[PDB]
Symmetry: C5
Subunit: 311 residues, 5 copies
């Protein structure tokens, strides 16, 4: 067996579809997700055409080995998918209806710049390589592209599963390659982030700010430095567990600013005490009183600037 012959000079159309059965193991660190789905394939092989009358059958079932089947591969997979041919059906005209169940660990880049208010498009790229006898081209039947209602990823809302209908046909190592883009659109469930991370982090910072209503240098040193320890401790607790991102994220910028604020509050506490000790209590008291407003105001403003820059 070799590819079906062209009637004219036309390429062979392999109609595809992917139906998600299970989506699992989305890994933010590895930028990978595990999928379990159906892969449907449809094409015409006139060599396989038959007279249903003089055959006594309206359909013919074949073993994968018995007939020509296109070699469809996935571009962005760790290793080749584990596939199980579910069914192969041939109709009197030579139409082949192929179906397999497969599992695969798909590599898809994730953008964490807007985390935890991010949305992602997961990609699954189907590909076919042409042979010398004839060019093979992929097509999508969107009726055949879907997902089980029960499919889920914890912490994400799965908006849709679709395919970009126009394939990407290009030459590679002297042969045409036809590629399809299947997209899984997901948006993060950011609720518990406010009470679980942000609010507690904010409270610690706010505690450090009470040093602006105290003249006790010993109590102030304990306030700013102990809260810095509590902040670091809290970040270890709520730690992403992923190796640090190469780029600056939204949450990343806020956290950097919180460290800057702890340093600035230490400078203030240091300045106020030095001024007091160096017989200048009027300047010390005026700085501390300004800080009471300057600190929350500069914080709230910089946060609005960051929110604006990222979104």
């Amino acid at each position: 067996v070799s590819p079906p012959p062209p009637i004219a000079d036309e390429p062979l159309t392999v109609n595809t579809g992917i139906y998600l059965i299970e989506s699992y193991s989305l890994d933010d660190c590895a930028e990978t997700f595990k999928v379990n789905a159906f892969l449907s394939l449809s094409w015409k092989d006139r060599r396989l055409a038959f007279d249903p009358v003089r055959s006594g059958v309206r359909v013919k079932t074949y073993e994968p080995e018995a007939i020509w089947i296109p070699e469809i591969r996935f571009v962005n997979v760790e290793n080749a998918r584990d596939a199980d041919v579910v069914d192969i059906s041939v109709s009197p005209d030579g139409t082949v209806q192929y179906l397999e169940r497969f599992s695969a660990r798909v590599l898809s880049p994730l953008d964490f710049r807007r985390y935890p208010f991010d949305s992602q498009t997961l990609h699954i790229y189907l590909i076919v390589r042409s042979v010398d006898t004839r060019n093979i081209v992929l097509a999508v039947d969107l009726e055949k592209v879907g997902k089980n209602d029960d499919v889920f990823l914890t912490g994400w809302d799965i908006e849709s599963f679709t395919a970009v209908v126009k394939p990407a046909n290009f030459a590679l190592e002297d042969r045409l390659e036809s590629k399809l883009d299947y997209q899984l659109r997901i948006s993060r469930q950011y609720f518990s982030y406010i009470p679980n991370i942000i609010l507690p982090m904010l409270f610690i910072l706010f505690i450090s700010w009470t040093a602006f209503w105290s003249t006790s240098y010993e109590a102030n040193v304990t306030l700013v430095v102990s809260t810095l320890i509590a902040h670091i401790a809290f970040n270890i607790l709520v730690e992403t567990n992923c190796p640090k991102t190469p780029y600056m994220t939204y949450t990343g910028a806020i956290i950097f600013m919180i460290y800057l604020f702890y340093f600035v509050a230490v400078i203030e506490v240091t300045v106020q005490h030095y001024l007091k000790v160096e017989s200048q209590p009027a300047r010390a008291a005026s700085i501390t009183r300004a800080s009471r407003i300057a600190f929350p105001v500069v914080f709230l403003l910089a946060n609005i600037i960051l929110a604006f820059l990222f979104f």
Copy 2:
């Protein structure tokens, strides 16, 4: 190696049964569980019916490749189950009795809203795809559904193993499919949750409340802030290792409240000292005295409200 022919036009009934041998590795982070069980299958194939007189034997044993066997798959699995056919028996009327031992990692969503007082229903979905010549329908043989008495999951109580007898018949990829729901009901047993996590966490909070029987601002700052560090430290220690849940859990709400209480106690400590320093000792002393009752009372009340809202 073709499906058994219908006597009329009826679909083929495949009577199923699952008998749990072992259940293990329930992973809370992954929402998966590993199972080891028997899968029994029974259907009628009249091409296999025989006369026990001119054969001699009351039962016939076949190799899987000698006869037609329905392809049963699991819907919610990572990869296909590891199976080993244990036995294939045919009775004189053509009734096939198939048995295999399998192991599988089943994906089943878990609800942590009532943790650690939560109960879960683990699902195992059997499925069969119909074939060209005839439709295949699943059924439950309750005589063949059960679990070994020694079956266990650490930290859980296994209430029951049962199946929803009526299958879910629907259409997939242009063919009819019959699905079954096997349910494993488990409820969390965490006897040690109180002593192990709760109490030490309450003691730390209670220590912060001793600041209401002290006028020393330096000692008060050390009490509230050092206990906040101890609280965060304790939460790192008793951390589940599972990424934070997208939703608000019961234990999650209690912990959020504990952070709020540390912030409120800091505000009090700050207010009391400012009033004392700003020549108002009457208002400072009256706030601190109120707090001694207000703090435990508001805590005990909010906890009753939370327990009521979640349960």
Copy 3:
């Protein structure tokens, strides 16, 4: 390729023997252990008997596929064992000397109530399902049950590897199952626990007791609260990495008591200071002096009670 026929009505005896080559990966969290061993099987199939004179051979070697071999499975395994048939020998009377090398991850419950002074019995359950034509029964020859001298599990003393000679014969899914219990007895190597965990944990607690020889409330608050932070920090450092146990362990009770002691010492420190401040230095001094004896005595007593209750 059918079971050997009976001479009367007696069941077929499959003589077993397990010889441990390697024991590894004992996971306390998973309650699982990986084993690599020999499995010996012995039975008589008269259909295989031969005249050594006619044959010109005193022994006959077969491929597993060529003859009837009982289907032996393990009850408490994650998946079916990976096996390599090492040898199949048939003597003139039809005796089969089967030998295979296998690896398997065995699930065996572990009791942590007496940790780290615990001993465990690891189980390996062999099983055979009886067929249509005849009943199959397992037997042990203890001469054939052993372990390599080099077998080891880090942190454990392996006392013995044996089998309970009497099989457990029972009905399951309308057939007989003959089950064998192979036991691996192990006892933990608790030495480094004293200098690594116990001793530093006691020193931290002892430091909090120095607050009973101090009147300085600021120094006392620093002693009790900072040591509580050090205790929690130390617990994070020496943490088992296994999720907390559903039941109350011995070490678990001691740790709970240590948290209770930190809370009680805070109460004392708080009471002392309040009485001292509120014009009652006679009570404050008498409480602190009592605590100096009360604390070590109540600790040493409760510990004896706990050691008695657990052992």
Copy 4:
């Protein structure tokens, strides 16, 4: 299924080419990287020569089992690559053009001395063992060497993918081996390191330097020791998760210096207080005043020396 015969005594040339489809999972700890690529192979096997006229076809397609294929292995792999033969094309002269898609976990040493400003050369070593009947030699078909434009490694810039055209031919276990070196050049994306690691670590160090504008020994002990705790805490937070490198890294030297600086600042704080207490306030005040300049200057100077020594 024996190697093609030589026309004279010439070795067989196997022309190779690797085209990267996906690159992923670079593991810094393991010094390994996962790759998914095409492996093209070409050689002349005259036994496969045909007349395009008698055959009809200008090219012949074969199954891997039908013809002799050289055994190409990778030297630096964990296990053998997972390969899937995409195409085998034979031209009339008997020139075979083989193409396979493979995935492999390649072991390649990484130098972390200049981290996070490091560049690495990842190696993939192709190898072929010569046979009894003839010597096999590898060659590079540069037309068939490349990488997909979309190839990415999070946190790295992929500079180039190339092959050292001259093979390394040597004797091993009495036969010739022909080895090829494919190189993937990558350079790290160090941006977020400044705001995420460097800057917050410098702020904690700077806070410790405020002890040089304070005479309060109690406040100074709190400053230096509490910041040391915050530093250690921060290091736990930003920890690589890879076991410590056997060699001294650039970042490793900076961190060692920061610990030295915390110790020196403690010595100063200790010296200043002892001089004050031992009736020498002139010496104490002159040391503290010097330290205010000495500390940032010696730090900035040692950092320039380190940056010079490493780069």
Copy 5:
């Protein structure tokens, strides 16, 4: 498919050789190491012996399935090695020369008593089980035992790869077994340990010793207790990453001593303050002055004793 016949009554000698291609993944927690190597096997089979003059070939090449090959297994492996037969050559006298490339995860116990100044001997145990017709014995072909020059293990110096030429012949499961010991000798690269672990741990302890030049009980409590927190924190940072070792290690003893020293320094600080407060300043001042010398001296002496006892 039968073993070669003996010329007299001699056992069959299988000459072995292992050539290391790659060594990777040495895991200290798991006490395992992954190896990729060649395994050469040589034995004489006269049934395969041929006259070269009437045969006309240098060496005959066979497929594994075609001829008898001894079953060589590894004793200390997780699962059976993944092997790929590279070549099978037969010379006129019947000498079979077998070669395979294999990968295996070898289990080899490690002694951490002298860590990080330890050396280890990694073992690879080859084994062969004798057959019905003849006894099989292993031997070492020293020409075929080696390692690639590029073989590496990060953090270790690979000293040698040798084999103990005399096999260990013994009886197992009623048959003779010939065992060979291949040894990989490695010594640890302990450099970065001094600046990364030892030095910062000694600085934290040294800071605690400044309490001997202070009379301030509040500052002393902060020094000793806060440094104990910093020590524990540092230990979490530099943590072994392996579950605790059952035996007392060298580094383990030093760390235990450091905890003892923190407790002793607390006792001193407590004693000095009590003596001062209980009208005995002569006794207090003399203890603190003694401690200034007693502490570093007792430390340096106990360390010399430990280094002597372990080495």
